[PDB]
Amino acid sequence: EIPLKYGATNEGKRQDPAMQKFRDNRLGAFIHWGLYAIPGGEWNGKVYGGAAEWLKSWAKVPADEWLKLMDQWNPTKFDAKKWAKMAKEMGTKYVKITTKHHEGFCLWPSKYTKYTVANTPYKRDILGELVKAYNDEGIDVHFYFSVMDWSNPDYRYDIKSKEDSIAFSRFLEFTDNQLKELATRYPTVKDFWFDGTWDASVKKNGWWTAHAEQMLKELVPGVAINSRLRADDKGKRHFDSNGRLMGDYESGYERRLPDPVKDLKVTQWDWEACMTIPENQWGYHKDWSLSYVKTPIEVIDRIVHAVSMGGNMVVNFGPQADGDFRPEEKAMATAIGKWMNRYGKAVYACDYAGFEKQDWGYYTRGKNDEVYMVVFNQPYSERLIVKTPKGITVEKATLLTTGEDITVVETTRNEYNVSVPKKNPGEPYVIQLKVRAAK
């Protein structure tokens, strides 16, 4: 039992209303928009296969030259109200937005650097416009923030001298200044999602991570803060040296998900996954032919997977330099929307059901103990196996969309066959169960 000044603060899950809202939302969208959208994965005639938002790094571009892209930042077609309508249509309950990515260009007019939307042809506070528009649609807004900043020469990868420590201290002050600015300018913010916190410099300054958390929580009542921010006294990240989760939720499942049989531990805390549509492109990349692009069902599978294990899912979009979305992303949002409008009662405000995973798909549990079977793999047996925990019986099954009764046959103590619907729904579908727990 190691003593710590900067380890975990919460005992278990938060149960205040703001955290309940963050959780119940379940489905979000991510927006990665920054200067990287202009070159779109291509530099000096070479198309790089790596993540477009990291092109400065793949193409070895100096800061001064990368940041000149500001001169071409003029997203003519940007319309925050349309963006918010797209998110509403998709069925997202929240949007996480890159306030500043590693490149250091700010989507709000920060008073602490010149690398902002203010000093571009477009001039306008993009972030402020998005906050307003999303909020006007009843959508919560979360702020991605990269600590690592390639634009600020006081940043250090590691502390190897008293000079390094001096510089980095001034960097942390700068960072605090931007964070306070974001929190006070945009007080409807519900979450800060930190990235670029893996460097030895940050690991060595655990105290600062804890301070940033407490500082923002004092400025924004009920605000959520991701685990990725946090390092403890010993430099251990996400979970402290006593194994306890720091921040309000776990945020390491990025383009991967916990195993539904082996990783049930994650049901013990709040957590949020994020994903990309191609294999690894967050910012806009001009050529999606270079890697596998997920289909809508593939994405819907991941979303349901997350909720079935007590987590949120956030699907990423990388808008074009002009401020519009590419057609693949429009088609995606629309397809997700269509399915969520039909089957969303099994996603929104749902959670882990505590049933043994079966091959047909995933269970989710509603606020009133509804148990939803979300079927992705249709058995040729025409029977969906349901193994119940001790003391739980299944009293009824109903096809969510039609209300039709579905036959349930008991096969053993604690197991049933739930019949597939008489007509094959032809898409991933939901059967709602009524269950009863014995006294």
Spatial CA neighbour of 317 closest among 273, 286, 277:
277
Dist. CA 394–CA 183, nearest whole Å? 48
Same fold, 1-348+438-439 and 349-437: no
Spatial CA neighbour of 416 closest among 429, 401, 434:
434
Q: Which amino acid is at 351?
A: D
How far does the chain reach from its first CA to its final CA, in angstroms?
Answer: 39
Q: Which two tokens stand for residue 143?
A: 């702020």
CATH tag, 1-348+438-439: 3.20.20.80
Q: What is the chain's alpha carbon radius of gyration, rounded to the nearest angstrom?
A: 23
349-437: which CATH architecture?
Sandwich (2.60)
Spatial CA neighbour of 99 closest among 239, 20, 199, 216:
216
Length of the chain: 439
Dist. CA 244–CA 428, nearest whole Å? 37
Q: Which two tokens stand for residue 256?
A: 């991967």
Dist. CA 79–CA 358, nearest whole Å? 44
250 φ/ψ angles, rounded to the nearest 5 degrees: -85, 130
Which method was used? X-ray
Dist. CA 370–CA 366, nearest whole Å? 5
β-sheet with 415-419: strand ranges across: 383-387, 415-419, 408-412
Dist. CA 436–CA 394, nearest whole Å? 7
Q: How far is CA 310 from CA 19, 276, 304, 329, in A?
A: 13, 20, 10, 26
Indicate if the alpha-carbon torsion angle 175, 322, 133, 340 is positive or negative: negative
Which residues, 6 or more positions from 259, have their beta carbon under 8 angstroms from its beta carbon? none
| DSSP conformation class of 240 | -
Spatial CA neighbour of 363 closest among 307, 302, 427:
307
Spatial CA neighbour of 103 closest among 113, 88, 93, 91:
113
Dist. CA 295–CA 18, nearest whole Å? 33
Spatial CA neighbour of 133 closest among 179, 81, 82:
81
Which residues, 6 or more positions from 11, have their beta carbon under 8 angstroms from its beta carbon? none
Q: How far is CA 419 from CA 20, 362, 379, 423, in A?
A: 34, 16, 10, 11
Enter the resolution in angstroms: 1.9
Q: Which amino acid is at 409?
A: V
Dist. CA 357–CA 302, nearest whole Å? 15
Helix residue ranges, H only, 91-205: 126-136, 162-185, 200-203
Ordered by start, the domain boundaries in the chain are 1-348+438-439, 349-437
Which residues, 6 or more positions from 251, have their beta carbon under 8 angstroms from its beta carbon? 193, 226, 227, 228, 238, 271, 272, 274
Residue 296 CA, chain-centre distance (Å), reads 17
Strands 224-225 and 311-317: unpaired
